[PDB]
Amino acid sequence: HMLTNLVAEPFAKLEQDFGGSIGVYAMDTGSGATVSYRAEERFPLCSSFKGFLAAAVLARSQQQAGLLDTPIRYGKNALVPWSPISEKYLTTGMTVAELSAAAVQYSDNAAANLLLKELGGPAGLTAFMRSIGDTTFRLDRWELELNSAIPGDARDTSSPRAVTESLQKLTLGSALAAPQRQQFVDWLKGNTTGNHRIRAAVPADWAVGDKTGTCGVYGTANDYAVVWPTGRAPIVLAVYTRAPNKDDKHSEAVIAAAARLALEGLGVNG
Ligand SMILES: *[B@@-]1(O)O[C@H](C#N)c2ccccc21
């Protein structure tokens, strides 16, 4: 508690201008200081579960040395909306590693559903998260049904705090073996969908990896990231939003602004 919110930041005004709720958790891994706002509330994961999905695949690959190289062929019926990479390889197949990279870096939905099947579905991903000590995360449904983002519905949600804690364990801690940890980091670093979210608050000369989520309803969107400022320890953070009305729009700018406030609250000069 002593190191949480040492410096207050105007998150309430930000979410009021947005017309909804913002949840933020950010950890300075050097000192343990944190910024926390609505950090234990549940928010829909949307596509942000796909980062943890890829980590779960990497964990399994530690016991199955041939897994990442395995070629997966799929039918047209696997190609749900927003499958920008897997649609280009329908007639050829893709490897497990390629599906994982597409799920992370392009938010590819067909790839995500194929990998979910490999792990035993939403309960299998949930079990992986339990295995690293995350008792908050729950995945319940598949793409695209998991994006419904219904107010008060705990299905397919986590908290900003649990997201950050699990991200730290997987990218900086010991939840993955070292080679798989760096592969997870590299996939996050190569994400293409997050340039207007946490990355927009991060100076260009710092390294960063992230995974976004966008549900398309209820003003519900999010991003989580690991950030390596030069000359100090990495920062892990999560920013989640939601809003009361089904047709409320999400805002990338609000996510970037919340990330800026989190870095300011940690005393990280940007
Ligand atoms: B997920 O939130 O990231 C993609 C985007 N934007 C996407 C598309 C369609 C459904 C879910 C998701």
From Swiss-Prot:
Name of this chain's protein: Carbapenem-hydrolyzing beta-lactamase KPC-2
Pfam families: Beta-lactamase2 (PF13354)
Active site: S47, E145
Catalytic activity as recorded in UniProt: a beta-lactam + H2O = a substituted beta-amino acid
Statement: the UniProt record of this protein carries the keyword Repeat: no
Activity regulation remarks: Not inhibited by EDTA, inhibited by clavulanic acid and tazobactam. Inhibited by cyclic boronates, including vaborbactam and bicyclic analogs of taniborbactam.
Residues annotated for a beta-lactam binding in this entry: S47, K50, W82, S107, N109, T212, T214
GO biological process: beta-lactam antibiotic catabolic process; response to antibiotic
Source superkingdom: Bacteria
Keywords: Antibiotic resistance, Hydrolase, Plasmid, Signal
Cross-referenced InterPro entries: Beta-lactam/transpept-like (IPR012338), Beta-lactam_cat (IPR045155), Beta-lactam_class-A (IPR000871)
Organism (species): Klebsiella pneumoniae
Additional information: Initially two different KPC beta-lactamases were identified from two different Klebsiella (KPC-1 and KPC-2); they were later shown to be identical. The class A beta-lactamase family has a specific amino-acid numbering system, sometimes called Ambler or ABL numbering and often misspelt as Amber. A multiple sequence alignment was used to derive a consensus sequence and then the consensus was numbered taking into account insertions and deletions. This allows use of identical numbers, e.g. for active site residues, despite differences in protein length. UniProt always uses natural numbering of residues, hence there appear to be differences in numbering between this entry and some papers.
